[PDB]
């Protein structure tokens, strides 16, 4: 019929075993299981990759990578511009698109049902339904960890000289 469906088994220590008939159902299971354990972590890291840390937390805080909120936000706003995200999505295979669509839907399903049993950030304005673009933002953040990501502060600091001697 449609659309997304997954069978999840958990063994000791909360390890999920996800079975599905296609990538979309598989992603659904992954997103739901991961949310049960780590919704707050993902939401925080998505705020970072969206360049919204200063909006929620102010200029005095840092990301989990220990970058100041504003320079981090400038870097991720630069990296994850709409045109970059859309080019990236357009280059994805149907299978990968489906994995990501399922993941977002599964994470969101858990959020709809969450009553705080395994989620400490219930009620925070930054804990919100996610989109496939948010997963692209996280992916690109990881992609550049071996490159321009290590120069985030240096990019933000790059300004032309003044009148100095």
């Amino acid at each position: 019929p449609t659309g997304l469906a997954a069978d999840i088994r958990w063994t000791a220590y909360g390890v999920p075993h996800i079975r599905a008939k296609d990538e979309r159902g598989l992603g659904y299971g992954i997103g739901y299981a991961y949310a049960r354990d780590n919704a707050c972590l993902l939401a925080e890291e998505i705020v970072t990759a969206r360049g919204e840390r200063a909006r929620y937390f102010g200029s005095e805080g840092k990301s989990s990578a220990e970058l100041d909120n504003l320079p981090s936000d400038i870097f991720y706003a630069w990296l994850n511009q709409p045109e970059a995200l859309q080019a990236f999505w357009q280059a994805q295979t149907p299978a990968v698109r489906q994995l990501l669509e399922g993941y977002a839907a599964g994470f969101n399903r858990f959020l709809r049902e969450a009553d705080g049993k395994t989620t400490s950030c219930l009620g925070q304005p930054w804990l919100r339904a996610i989109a496939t673009d948010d997963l692209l933002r996280l992916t690109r953040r990881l992609l550049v960890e071996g490159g321009v990501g290590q120069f985030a502060d240096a990019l933000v600091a790059a300004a032309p000289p003044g009148a100095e001697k």
Binding site: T2, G29, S120, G147, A157, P161
Partner: protein, 548 residues
Amino acid sequence: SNAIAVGSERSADGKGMLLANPHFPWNGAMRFYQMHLTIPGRLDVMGASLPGLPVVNIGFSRHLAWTHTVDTSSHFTLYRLALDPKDPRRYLVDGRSLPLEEKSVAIEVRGADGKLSRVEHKVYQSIYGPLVVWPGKLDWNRSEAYALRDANLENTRVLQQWYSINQASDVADLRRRVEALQGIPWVNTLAADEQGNALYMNQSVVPYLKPELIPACAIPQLVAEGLPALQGQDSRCAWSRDPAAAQAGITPAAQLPVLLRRDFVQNSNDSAWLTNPASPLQGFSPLVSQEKPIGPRARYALSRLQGKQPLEAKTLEEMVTANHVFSADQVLPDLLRLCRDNQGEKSLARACAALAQWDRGANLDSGSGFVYFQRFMQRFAELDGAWKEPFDAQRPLDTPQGIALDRPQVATQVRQALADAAAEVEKSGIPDGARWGDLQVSTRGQERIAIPGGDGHFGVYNAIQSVRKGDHLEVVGGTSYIQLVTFPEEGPKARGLLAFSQSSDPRSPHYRDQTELFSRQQWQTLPFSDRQIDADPQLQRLSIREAA
């Protein structure tokens, strides 16, 4: 990270075996998470992954196990720009003045009043990429500036790449799939399969420059320091094109290091060079792999791996769980001799006793000798010419070794280094009796758990990084997802742990359960077959669905 793949010629069962020991953060966007994925008939893979990714990053399947370590290859280049003498916002390529591009981003900032303000920021860009400034080294003055070209910005293949790896049957298939797509951004890949092949690949996305361009296109001062820096005023220094590469400007797969053997391969973040010393990997671009002295983790691994005795699963496990501080093997014997030559030097007395009684480990019950040794090494690192036997490229596994105590200046500086280290240790708040496990911990809510292991720079295979917080050292990264895989007839047997546990949320039943196990170094079955899964008395099942 460590990785060891063992093949049919060395494994006790004549089949493949893989130890995966990545060293990664215990929190945040790189926190590993275990999962098993199955689309019956065509996908069945288990391992661990990074947050947000719907694929397995390090794992195993019916006939194959693989893992990754961060490589030494460059994945970007800096470009030194020659600025227009009339305008520092313009730069010269082949003598022609080009304008920088400007891209403004706007950010909302929550103020003290709790309201949002808008902040705009200009990002300057060249044809190579954005400009970057490191004050005092990479400045933007009226003569020069630096731009950065990141090779992975155009790597749209990265998710596809791991999904493809997740579908791989054996080592040959894995190699085909990685070489075909070239979507791996910044790690090596090591793998073993049931038939007993052991594979190392330095197959990642690396800027390509034809060999004849490198001498003139490099910035000599900067590459000497290990920065991949090129001359950005010459159009001939653009990354080279080769139709065989999966992406314009990257190095084709055939020019990247691969070693396929039946004995072993290993990597602990050094270059491809001594993956297996019996078959050194040489002759590659400096952007890819260089013959640099290996670090103590690799030197430790090779000391255990070399030779003719069969390797058992237990052997690989215990290379991790022994917590041996391998750097001590090079300096501790001569250091203790200095201690013996200096009894009655009251300032060295406590340090010398602690070092002498020390088990040379980073175990929970290792004594304060480890702490003294760490602080001494931090200072020894920085002394000039103090090795008795300095690095010998003809003996890259056995050097450097020893302290040059027969040189009076060295003996003087080494003793002073120990005196200073001892002083530092003793003016810290460390009690009497205290063992390493009393000091290094992972906080869980209102409680702590003692964590074994120590910094990888001291040659501890079980690498653990911690930072001082209050009365303790708080673990921030290191050993994370552990998997040790063998292939008996029934199906793959995987054993390991996720050191920091599945959940980062203090409310979860899975916030500290594996962390208690990691403390006691008690690895567990990673159940993969339906039979293994059904045998778990903790088994729970949920089926979920919703409309598209």
